[PDB]
Amino acid sequence: VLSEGEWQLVLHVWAKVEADVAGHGQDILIRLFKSHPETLEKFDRFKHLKTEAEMKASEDLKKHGVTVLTALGAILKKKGHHEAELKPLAQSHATKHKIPIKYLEFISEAIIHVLHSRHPGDFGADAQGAMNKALELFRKDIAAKYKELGYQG
Template identity: 45%
Template structure:
């Protein structure tokens, strides 16, 4: 909802101050809690779970993920921001909609 979006944006500055570290934590948590998702990222497939935290490549990709998430939050539901990202994930990366639920 928009109120959820506003609540997140109110503290988003802290996240933006260190996107790589927070992004790395988000992806590490995702891969740890849902190990099957790691295979969706070919460059991370061979990284053992014990080595995920602090991995520079994961932090860099996490930075990209959180940067895009910030753009989506700031756009407040605008399809101009969401549609190209959804199209890329569906057509280029072949990511199923079920992975976003």
């Protein structure tokens, strides 16, 4: 359960994300795709890009980073009371996209990396701990909804 002060740390660095959601989305997905190339396979509109400039140049990748961060920012704003927001994610992610929990760990790790890299002044140890807790709560709750839906994840 995060404390109120930990949610404030999470939402404080997220306001920095919100100044440029698409730029942050491209960097997060580029870090994910470079760290774990196999996740790039889920994306047919850009599964063949090979360099960072290609990926920066991709309109579909840029749109997808905004899809990811818009939904993730609405979740975090719920401060853990996110069941209604997670219900549509877990449906499509369990039945159409088939996204393993290991993949949700990989992008969490990409998210923390890009936040440290772009916002180290607003993402010190305590903020990093608070964000790691919020993403760990999101992954736990998704994982349990995937099981309800018969997807192991």
